[model samples]
Target: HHAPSYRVKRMDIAKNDEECVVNAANPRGLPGDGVCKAVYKKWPESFKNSATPVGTAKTVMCGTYPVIHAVGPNFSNYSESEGDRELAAAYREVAKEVTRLGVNSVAIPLLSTGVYSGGKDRLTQSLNHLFTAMDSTDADVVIYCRDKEWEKKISEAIQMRT
Candidate 1:
């Protein structure tokens, strides 16, 4: 079952009360062309570590909560062979990290879907898979966004989940 505390809302990452927040990250471990550049700039030195690849994540302590660098497939320049698998793995890695921290609260963005240009299927699948993984952790989760349009997309994705 999905957590009753899980949410999808139009809120900024810094304003949230979660134990950690996620970033739509690149393999270089730096901020990518996506919705989270402002958060990255706030902690310019946080990503100085090794580059994280797609299907993986890295966490840094530099903000309201730990910023989880979730490297999703960059559709802007990607191979079809790995897109579907990597997208799902990206969100799954966040779920695994959230569980590892044993955190009760987390704020995640829909993996990809910004300048990474993830298509509708990413949202449709990743949300279900993320929540499914999160279901076992019992964390208070919020999939935060800045736009109602994206929020609406999230809702439909939930309803469309298998």
Candidate 2:
């Protein structure tokens, strides 16, 4: 069983039954490098078509459960319009797909917070947006962070939604 709150620490994704792991990574996509590779090692078959024409590398399982490598700038080019909203929207889109596959639970890591070089406010907003999108569905959404800092941020964001 999983906890009812978020956490913060070194990013890692693990699977437990029907629920799949989710996390953020560099623009290069999953199965290529970074956290995605670690996730891929757990389920190498999950990366059949991980690449998007826009260069957005997203790995999906059975074409629904996804390990999304959020598309946006890293430390190099952080722009709000092209950054936060786009990433948030991507997560929502992926979440919908995941839900469509009949997955009732998803555990996500703190997106774009670590080496991706995104700010807390931006990441928080994106996470909140994704959570809001999932609220209408009958799924149990779990946001797992790396440690206390990220846990607090994600918890606050979810609380702000109500």
Candidate 3:
């Protein structure tokens, strides 16, 4: 039984008090114009200072908390399979970094689901990959949904898994 503890909630990632917040970013570590924009707005330098390449991740300090910016695939040029691969890479990178940093809790948004247009199936697959990647670690993964609809969908997916 390697099942990892998972939590799904409707909340703001920026206000999260977890050890780290994992968000999707572009090749240049730029927070895209979706939920990540709020993060960029709050910590302009954190986003500007992080220059991670695509399919990679970087941890930056925002006030007293660490934020993991995982660069995802280019939405304009990625196929379904490619998106899944990149998304998995991003999640794995985050998990590795969190374990290295000894963080016990992390908050992650629905990566590539909004502005990147990865769709619900993609979100489900990405969440599954994230869960599996972090199973070896003791970190509790919290999936934050910004709205009721997203919360419901994510809850259903998590339920199917458990």
Candidate 4:
């Protein structure tokens, strides 16, 4: 476990000569529903929850990756603290779990920033916090955004250091 840092790239998954790949969930939580499922199927145990909110973590392991649910509504109706705070909390838990298992790197999706609640802005906040928290660990962070817009959003977020 270590502090977090930031970087930018166009690939959905990336690493630093180590093990790297960013994995994200589809907009909804349904298994095999979106791109995340496709990627998860390719590497079943490579995915994990980026951040689940406070009260919506029903069954944990949506697949092989652990879940990081937030605590508020997706994003449309979430309160003020729904962004970083919730995500950081979830990230902390997930990171610890991932690192504890000796996994050097883990792929993460943009959390819930599409149809759900944690839109681009909130997603950025959660992402930043999550990455920040894991800066010093041996684990390399890999993120998968699904499309160019999201890739751009993440790039912009990291560039601006939000």
Candidate 5:
């Protein structure tokens, strides 16, 4: 199998070319803030999500596309190292869910950035693990960021990688 070609997109999550979106879960409440917040705003039906395990996901319908709510680790509860590990597995879980849906292109959210609070420290881990997960899916991946600065931040991280 071949690795998925992944890139960053600083655009509307629902207005992109991706066949489906993989959003970040609230992990406690319904759709809290960030991508999922807007996602729920657009499609209220997507907000009816149940408690999903950390590093795993549940799927729901959104317009013509399907959305995956990937529950990443909460750094407030777990240590950074633990977050890294669970976040890695979370990536793979999202990949598995994406593959289950059989979508050609996926819109992945920049999870753990806000609610999960991995901060800038785990950016590399997120990117690296996302690649690892999306690679197995054999589907094109786009890391969707609502904030424009995130594109540059991720791009800089990609550039600074040696």
Candidate 6:
């Protein structure tokens, strides 16, 4: 079998050319108080209108591209196994949405790794799970990183998987 196309880049999720951008959102439909806050600001109605239950995901089209807002598990009282399960669920949801929408490209941030919590190791786990979930699809997945360090770490993780 062929390996899926993957990359870790330091870029804005909004500016990516991918037809879908996956947002790691909270249950309340707020996507944290960080970089993703701008996403909620730019598409207030989309977040509001696409709200779903916790640990669930919703997709909304923002202009030309669709954005998948996957609700992540809370890390306040965290467990590694639980975190991994939730992250895998979120990735599966994204893969389903990408396939359902027939998108050729999709971009996602490292879910649960930013202001949402979970450490670098968890981020690596999340990326591996995501890679496995999307590998069978035609979608070219781009994992958008906040900076160069994340780009390097995630790139290495992906390489090890390949």
Per-model root-mean-square deviation over C-alphas = 3.3, 4.6, 2.8, 6.0, 2.9, 2.5
C-alpha lDDT score of every prediction, in listed order: 0.72, 0.55, 0.75, 0.50, 0.75, 0.74
- Candidate 1 stretches with Cα past 4 Å from truth are 1-4, 118-122, 156-162
What is the model-wide C-alpha lDDT for candidate 4?
0.50
Clashing pairs in 3: none
Q: What would the TM-scores of all predictions be? A: 0.81, 0.68, 0.85, 0.55, 0.83, 0.85
Error of 5 at 6 (Å): 1.7
Candidate 1: Cα lDDT at 49 = 81
Lowest lDDT 10-residue stretch of candidate 1: 117-126
Candidate 6 local lDDT, residue 45:
61
Q: How displaced is residue 103 in candidate 3, in Å?
A: 1.0
Predicted candidate 1: what Cα RMSD to the true structure? Answer: 3.3
Q: CA lDDT of 141 in candidate 2?
A: 65
Question: RMSD (Cα, Å) of candidate 4?
Answer: 6.0
Candidate 4 wrong stretches, greater than 4 Å: 1-32, 39-73, 82-84, 118-123, 153-162
lDDT of 5: 0.75
**Superposed model 2: Cα runs more than 4 Å off:** 1-11, 15-18, 23-34, 53-59, 62-75, 118-123, 156-162
- Cα lDDT tens digits, model 4, 36-120, are 4555555554334433334322224544443432232355555656544554554565566566556665665555555545344
Q: For this target, which candidate reaches the highest lDDT against the unseen true structure?
A: 3
lDDT of 3 by residue, 1-162 (tens): 544567888887877778888876776766568767877876667775687876678988878778788877655678878877887788789889888878778988866777676444356666677776777678878888777976888888777865
The clash numbers for all candidates, in the given order, read: 0, 6, 0, 27, 0, 0
For 1-162, candidate 2 gives per-residue lDDT tens digits of 533333333345554333655545444444655555566677666555555522133646645455554443453366756666555655665566556656656666545555555434456565665665566666566665556676676677666756
Off by over 4 Å in 3: 1-4, 118-121
